[PDB]
Structure 1
Amino acid sequence: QLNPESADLRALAKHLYDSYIKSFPLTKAKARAILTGKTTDKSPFVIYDMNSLMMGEDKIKFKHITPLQEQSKEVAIRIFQGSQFRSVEAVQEITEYAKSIPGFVNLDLNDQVTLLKYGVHEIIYTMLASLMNKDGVLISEGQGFMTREFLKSLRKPFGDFMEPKFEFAVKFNALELDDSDLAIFIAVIILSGDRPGLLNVKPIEDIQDNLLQALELQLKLNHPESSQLFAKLLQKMTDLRQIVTEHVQLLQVIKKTETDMSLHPLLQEIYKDL
């Protein structure tokens, strides 16, 4: 119970959390409810092999996550392209959230683009953890669940495109953060003044500082018993970079190995000279 300074920090966290619920259709709260398999109304269909994938398509309504095409004749590529269009959608969701971050749209246009360019994938993997457990990941807005082993057995290049994420997710999830915490953390990620090419770093840092103050307060009030949670969370920022890097790397291999597979233009630009 304290000052007007802390009051503004609480108002900020509320605004961000509010925007978060409004920008992301599938929150961590909903993901855990589905994953903890509590209910009889939210049960996901599980894909763990070829025949379940074959049934899942029939049961699950995979809203063109892999736009028009029969069977690209390779589950591996269908699955991959799918992960791509979903990524694109995720970028759309994140971009919308970014606009709600106080001060973000007031920044220089080119810098707005730079921050999104380097921040969206770090955010994507951060939020993906919410949809994961050590055994698999939720898909189709929680309608389905694809096992970690099914993926890990796809085929040479693809067979391991999600593993690093799972390794991250299991660790990150140990922090037991909730949507109210993630909303501010993701805002911090985007307002990173050390992104390559930023024209005006100061205004960005001023904004990030306020967000960090907001995040720090949020974590002590929400997780009283979690000593140094603030620092452990910030330290996870290093794991995200690594995830992104080896992903981009695997992508260069795919590009050369699959001369016959199209990669989404938005994603290509995001990875250009990244």
Structure 2
Amino acid sequence: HMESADLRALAKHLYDSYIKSFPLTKAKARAILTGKTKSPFVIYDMNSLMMGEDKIKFKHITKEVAIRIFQGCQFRSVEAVQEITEYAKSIPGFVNLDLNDQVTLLKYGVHEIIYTMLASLMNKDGVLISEGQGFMTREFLKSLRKPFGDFMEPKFEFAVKFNALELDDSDLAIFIAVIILSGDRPGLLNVKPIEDIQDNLLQALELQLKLNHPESSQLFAKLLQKMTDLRQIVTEHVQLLQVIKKTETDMSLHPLLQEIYK
């Protein structure tokens, strides 16, 4: 169906575009998390949060602290959506799809991709922020009041298991493309070219994982099994947000801000 050279070309194409599209790759994030490269500024409690937003001055972080961090996660997610959207245009065939289907694939895909790429920034002890210039501890995030603490912890829980696959950026670039080209998103008009592109991406991912992880038994199957979960986690996620909206009233934004985050 496809030749190995075409699959390697597709894989290289996607890695290159993935490098241009996302500000902090997994390779650089890991160097920061491990201690293998200016230490990031560490946020571990209320006082160090206050110094970090007065020193680094995070555009997301800057009345109650738990609310402020939660909304900072939203600000960054909105940024990620545009980065993923630009990445999608580099996937071969994507821009030739019907315009409504492009929108639909992005609309229902970004949540899964944001979770996936968040893991690249996370270890069991915390998460990089502001392009790796800061590090906020898991314990500080989990200890936020209300439901905000239990909103943060499931991301870490997923990340630790996903990170045990030890995927690198060239693996992730194809994996992310596969998620986008999901022919079962609701309301798609023309499923057939979407599945045709996804089939080529899956062949590419399969070959990429055998060449890059030749000792990792059935990694391909295990990664698709993670694409199973991601569906669940995302559904859990939206049910968490809606509960927050109906319970909390200290969370009103300028109506324009609400529209941006709609």
TM-score range, shorter chain: over 0.9
1:239 is displaced (CA, Å) by: 1.6
1:255 is displaced (CA, Å) by: 0.9
Distance 2:260 2:226 in 1: 22
Aligned residues of 2:60 and 2:76 also touching (Cα < 8 A): no
* Structure 1: runs of 5+ lacking an equivalent: 67-72
Aligned residues of 2:32 and 2:132 also touching (Cα < 8 A): yes
* Structure 2: runs of 5+ lacking an equivalent: none
Answer with 181-190 or 244-253: which moved more.
244-253
Residue 254 to residue 58, structure 1, CA distance change in 2 (3 Å): same
Residue 243 to residue 208, structure 1, CA distance change in 2 (3 Å): same
- 1:19-63 superposed Cα distances (whole Å, 9 cap, x missing partner): 00000010000100110112xxx4111111001101111222313
Residue 221 to residue 267, structure 1, CA distance change in 2 (3 Å): farther
Aligned residues of 2:30 and 2:121 also touching (Cα < 8 A): yes
1:188 is displaced (CA, Å) by: 0.2
Seq. identity, %? 100
1:180 is displaced (CA, Å) by: 0.4
Residue 264 to residue 90, structure 1, CA distance change in 2 (3 Å): farther
Residue 263 to residue 8, structure 1, CA distance change in 2 (3 Å): farther
1:259 is displaced (CA, Å) by: 3.1
Residue 93 to residue 56, structure 1, CA distance change in 2 (3 Å): same
Question: What SS does the corresponding residue of 2:135 show, helix, strand or coil?
Answer: strand
Aligned residues of 2:14 and 2:174 also touching (Cα < 8 A): yes
Distance 1:239 1:176 in 2: 17
TM-score by length of 2: 0.94
Paired position in structure 2 for 1:24: 22
Residue 178 to residue 32, structure 1, CA distance change in 2 (3 Å): same
1:181 is displaced (CA, Å) by: 0.3
Distance 1:108 1:139 in 2: 35
Question: What SS does the corresponding residue of 2:244 show, helix, strand or coil?
Answer: helix
Distance 1:94 1:267 in 2: 21
Alignment: residue pair count:
259
- 1:192-219 superposed Cα distances (whole Å, 9 cap, x missing partner): 0011111111000000000000000000
- 1:217-258 superposed Cα distances (whole Å, 9 cap, x missing partner): 000000010010000000001221121111101111111122
Aligned residues of 1:45 and 1:143 also touching (Cα < 8 A): yes
Aligned residues of 2:60 and 2:71 also touching (Cα < 8 A): no
Residue 156 to residue 260, structure 1, CA distance change in 2 (3 Å): closer
Aligned residues of 2:78 and 2:261 also touching (Cα < 8 A): no
Distance 1:204 1:32 in 2: 33
Aligned residues of 1:184 and 1:215 also touching (Cα < 8 A): yes
Distance 1:47 1:173 in 2: 22
Question: What SS does the corresponding residue of 2:128 show, helix, strand or coil?
Answer: strand
Residue 262 to residue 15, structure 1, CA distance change in 2 (3 Å): farther
Residue 104 to residue 268, structure 1, CA distance change in 2 (3 Å): farther
Question: What SS does the corresponding residue of 2:250 show, helix, strand or coil?
Answer: coil
Question: What SS does the corresponding residue of 2:182 show, helix, strand or coil?
Answer: coil
- 1:155-210 superposed Cα distances (whole Å, 9 cap, x missing partner): 12211112111111101101110000000000000000011111111000000000
Aligned residues of 1:118 and 1:270 also touching (Cα < 8 A): no
Distance 1:93 1:64 in 2: 16
- 1:86-130 superposed Cα distances (whole Å, 9 cap, x missing partner): 000000100000011111111111111110011001000001000
Distance 1:202 1:169 in 2: 32
- Could you list the runs of 4 or more consecutive aligned residues of structure 1 that deviate by over 6 angstroms after TM superposition? 263-272
1:65 is displaced (CA, Å) by: 5.5
Residue 253 to residue 267, structure 1, CA distance change in 2 (3 Å): farther
Question: What SS does the corresponding residue of 1:214 show, helix, strand or coil?
Answer: helix
Question: What SS does the corresponding residue of 1:162 show, helix, strand or coil?
Answer: helix
Question: What SS does the corresponding residue of 1:189 show, helix, strand or coil?
Answer: helix
1:268 is displaced (CA, Å) by: 8.0
Residue 261 to residue 271, structure 1, CA distance change in 2 (3 Å): closer
Aligned residues of 2:15 and 2:170 also touching (Cα < 8 A): yes
Residue 163 to residue 266, structure 1, CA distance change in 2 (3 Å): farther
Residue 203 to residue 245, structure 1, CA distance change in 2 (3 Å): same
Distance 2:30 2:138 in 1: 17
